[PDB]
Design a protein around this ligand. Structure first.
Ligand SMILES: [Mg+2]
Ligand SMILES: [Mg+2]
Ligand SMILES: [Zn+2]
Ligand SMILES: [Zn+2]
Lengths: 16, 153, 21, 181
């Protein structure tokens, strides 16, 4: 098996 | 072009947190095993393994930016949950830290590997496990940053 | 002598959240 | 609040800044507490506290500030204190002075890095870990905050011995009041 990335968190609050 | 220090990761059985510090994406052995991480160029093997420390590290993935280690020595921490809530915490020993507002155990679960941050937003440890007296979590255990440095060599 | 011009901003009042897809 | 975290955004190009500088009419919309501002030679920082947008005189000199209703003449000036200010632009967000009197301060750079600083005097304070002088350049007029998130002062000058910065010299919040009479 392998570990999968499913989401990220940005501590700065920065938007796109 | 918007990048995150903290990764929400998954396996078949569990689901937890990873945190990128100094070129390495870090997390807990009790969630990971010796698993590889998934990249679009196939599987990627761990760089650092430490059973004694509950610690594991891969090379930091795409769409990630690293946190810097804490410098201020401050003992007033803030833990980040996988829903992005901030919990205030007070440091006792090297790995001990007591909650300012005690919480149900359900609420901290799945948030291992996540960071414990000083007031400057810098990094102090990764959340190892919760201490519970009859289902109510009152303090926390964490892996200090000085470890993730000594592991790096 | 010209004028001072704003060319960017730095936002403190931002708080951690989950990057939307 | 706590913890302090910052992020940076760029709003204007090089040709853009130059044209705006002359015309003195700036139509872009505004957000945040710290603004990255620039002239012809220099480029530095300006901080909103209590309805006033403040910056360093060794940068702004005596100039006006380009607003959407044309150029806007300075409200306060104090050369001896290296300070200047205009009315804070529409859409800005103001900071509130410190009260805690705490001695553990936090410097915000033009790259949105948050540096830990320990107070000594009223105008001085020391770096917890040394950095090259080039890194701190262009961050003058950036705020220094207590751990609660409040204004303690503004970064004026840096202490270096062989191209490596050791300490910082800043304008305290009392010196704002001073200058408003
Ligand atoms: Mg913020
Ligand atoms: Mg930042
Ligand atoms: Zn720190
Ligand atoms: Zn304060």
């Amino acid at each position: 098996g392998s570990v999968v990335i499913v989401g990220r968190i940005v501590l700065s609050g920065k938007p796109a | 072009q918007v990048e995150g220090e903290v990764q929400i990761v998954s396996t078949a059985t569990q689901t937890f947190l990873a945190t990128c510090i100094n070129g390495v994406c870090w997390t807990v052995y009790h969630g990971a095993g010796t698993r590889t991480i998934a990249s679009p160029k196939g599987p990627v093997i761990q760089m650092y393994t430490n059973v004694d420390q509950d610690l594991v590290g891969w090379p930091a993935p795409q769409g990630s930016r690293s946190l810097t280690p804490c410098t201020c020595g401050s003992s007033d921490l803030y833990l980040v949950t996988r829903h992005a809530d901030v919990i205030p915490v007070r440091r006792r020993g090297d790995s001990r830290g007591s909650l300012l507002s005690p919480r149900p155990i359900s609420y901290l679960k799945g948030s291992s590997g996540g960071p414990l941050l000083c007031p400057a937003g810098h990094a102090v440890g990764l959340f190892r496990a919760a201490v519970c007296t009859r289902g109510v979590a009152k303090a926390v255990d964490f892996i200090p940053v000085e470890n993730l440095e000594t592991t790096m060599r």
